[PDB]
Design a protein that fits this description.
Chain lengths: 382, 391
């Protein structure tokens, strides 16, 4: 009856996104898909109770099962330490997860025909990638700061003057990048393309950091010929090319939030972690706690699930799951395009002072409209 | 009858901006203000004829007279060397001027009510100020180290940057003198007090604990010793914020702050070089010479070039001159010219770039905008009326 979805790592989160995450599972996922679900509770109280061990176990499960879908989580600050009486200022779960997995983060805004964009010409989305270290120190007083390279065979020594501090002190730092990290960025970028069926654009300073940025340009061109369209451009020339076009390209960059998605793509081409690019929407959660009506956009959170499920389906050659993930993305866009949307989107169209209650749906009404539309779409498909 | 404006250093430039610059002087400045004008011709042919000596003399004149107003200039590349048969690839005049003066460049987009922004909440502008490196290819395995050798002969300090054990890559060294950080802090505090807005410094001091920590410590020290009382008197403040926390607050805010960063139509983008002394200022448009429009102008074709950024170079320069000289009539004139410029656009009279921001470039009709000369004439008519009404 229901689709056999296979192995998925799910991470529960905090505040308004936690409410939305449960609604998505109950209304959009669980009525259609059965999963061998590896669920980790990354809610702040559980991270505190387990001394953050839950976060490390979730990252290891993503590494083992290749598919991670994560709800937004609170990153503690002093105010959060007091609010929850935390044992310590726990590090960001996203930072912990990224450190364990590695990879490149790709960000993509979901586009709807009736929702204004930065450039009206944008019909197809733009997927921006950045690869995801330094030795800094105080220069106590006058003297030379030099950076040297000694090849391991001892045949040469190259010394570069960083600066001769003559009047006083300051600060200095040394930075590096290994060819393997640049290679991993290139792979993830060509493999983000091919999967999406779009062209790739690499942008660098190149005119300023000629040797550092030149190596990225050279490694990308080399990998494009040996193992794989693709084109390089300067930052200034690139933003101009983005001001034109219908969009629909991957932009590897070396240097409403409710519609912003994020995907971590590991160099292996096997592991993916998807999530909303926004936070826990604390202000809406405070309204919910006071009995006030909320209108929180679930699109970014739904697309974490669809990107995760589409990846799972690709790994397992599961056609029914691949169809479901795509159908849920289309239903989400189509619902908004038919005029049914949350307040943030009504405000993008009308301007916040001109938004009336009849222009939007509350959190629960929007989720119910998506559920009704999804039921219809899948019934007609079979 | 005309305002006695005093001592101003003016730098003439190239292509479309050179045409606009002359129109501004003839229609907006010279009918109202008399200046002891120190004019330098930084047009590309004159920089070539003088072996760039004109650029160095202009920078020394700004140092001496404290007020510089500069027109956009061509920075030569190989194509420009061929076009003008240049003796050499002269360095950017902006780079030469900045090296002689020092100081921090503050950028600000001019806001009009009927012109769409990035964040609709931004009612007040955001003024962003920014603060060299030695990079190289690491051809294969080996050690990259960064060393500090005291000038007094005490023990050399060696830090390992990375030991490349397989394959190559790239490495770089970067630095900052305490004096450059102190200058950045002073120019930033001077900017915020002049504008009457709060100041934020953003760094990644949690990652670059020593490097960015020094910026955070020097700004806080200079604030506590020399500017905290003055900031309180104007009900404004200074705060350090991490870059991640800073971008999030910038979207939430209605604008109206100075942002010192440790790291829309170009026709509306202004730039001001603020020297740490609080006395010297160099103002200019943040855009270039608008070569594409200049090519149309050379062919006798109608152009619609936005002069706002160029007008604001003159108004920022004149407002600073007026502040230094306690010249109330000049202070009023500079403010009136800024207001006339914004008000003209807000009344529906604008160049094509702005009509395109409203309607979208494919939907712009000739009746939606004014050409370069029509727009300058409308500003001249509005300026005359405003100053008459002012008494
Ligand atoms: N990936 C992550 O886990 C992640 C990322 C960022 C922040 N955070 C955490 O999230 C918490 C809250 O951070 P924050 O309030 O600064 O950022 P945020 O949750 O992204 O929310 C900022 C504002 O953006 C709007 N917004 C964001 N997501 C929305 C959605 N889905 N639907 C409708 N409007 C939406 C709301 O604007 P209006 O208020 O005008 O309605 C909201 O108050 C913090 O504890 C922070 O650590 C986590
Ligand atoms: N501060 C300076 O002295 C400075 C700064 C930057 C560059 N440059 C020099 O400027 C020359 C030309 O550079 P560029 O064409 O790359 O840059 P640019 O002059 O800033 O012009 C780029 C484009 O932006 C638009 N634009 C810029 N200023 C405008 C204005 N005032 N009104 C209307 N539209 C405006 C035009 O767009 P559309 O074509 O779409 O109409 C123009 O073609 C080069 O020689 C460069 O060295 C000098």
């Amino acid at each position: 009856k229901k689709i056999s979805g296979g192995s998925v790592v799910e991470m529960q989160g905090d505040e308004m996104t936690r409410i939305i995450w449960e609604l998505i599972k109950e209304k959009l996922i669980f009525p259609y898909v059965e999963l061998d679900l590896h669920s980790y509770d990354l809610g702040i109280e559980n991270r505190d109770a387990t001394n953050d061990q839950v976060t490390k176990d979730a990252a290891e499960a993503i590494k083992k099962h290749n598919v991670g879908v994560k709800c937004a989580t609170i990153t503690p600050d002093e105010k959060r330490v007091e609010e929850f009486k935390l044992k310590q200022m726990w590090k960001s779960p996203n930072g912990t997860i990224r450190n364990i997995l590695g990879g490149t983060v790709f960000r993509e805004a979901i586009i709807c025909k009736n929702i204004p964009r930065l450039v009206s010409g944008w019909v197809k989305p733009i997927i921006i990638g950045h690869h995801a270290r330094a030795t800094d120190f105080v220069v106590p007083g006058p003297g030379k700061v030099e950076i040297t390279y000694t090849p391991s065979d001892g045949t040469q020594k190259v010394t570069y003057l960083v600066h001769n501090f003559e009047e006083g002190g300051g600060v200095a730092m040394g930075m590096y990048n290994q060819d393997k990290s640049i290679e991993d960025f290139a792979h993830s970028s060509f493999q983000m393309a091919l999967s999406k069926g779009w062209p790739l654009y690499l942008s660098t300073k190149n005119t300023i950091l000629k040797k550092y940025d030149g190596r990225f340009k050279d490694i990308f061109q080399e990998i494009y010929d040996k193992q794989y369209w693709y084109e390089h451009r300067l930052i200034d020339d690139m933003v101009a090319q983005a001001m034109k076009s219908e969009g629909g390209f991957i932009w590897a960059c070396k240097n409403s939030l409710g519609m912003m998605t994020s995907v971590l793509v590991c160099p292996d081409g096997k592991t993916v972690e998807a999530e909303a690019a926004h936070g826990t929407v604390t202000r809406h959660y405070r309204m919910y706690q006071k009995g006030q009506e909320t209108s929180t956009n679930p699109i970014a959170s739904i697309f974490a699930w669809t990107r995760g499920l589409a990846h799972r389906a690709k790994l397992d050659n599961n056609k029914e799951l691949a169809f479901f993930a795509n159908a849920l993305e289309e239903v989400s866009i189509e619902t908004i395009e038919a005029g049914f949307m949350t307040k943030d989107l009504a405000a993008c169209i009308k301007g916040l002072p001109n938004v009336q209650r009849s222009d939007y749906l509350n959190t629960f009404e929007f989720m119910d409209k998506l559920g009704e539309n999804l039921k219809i779409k899948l019934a007609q498909a079979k």
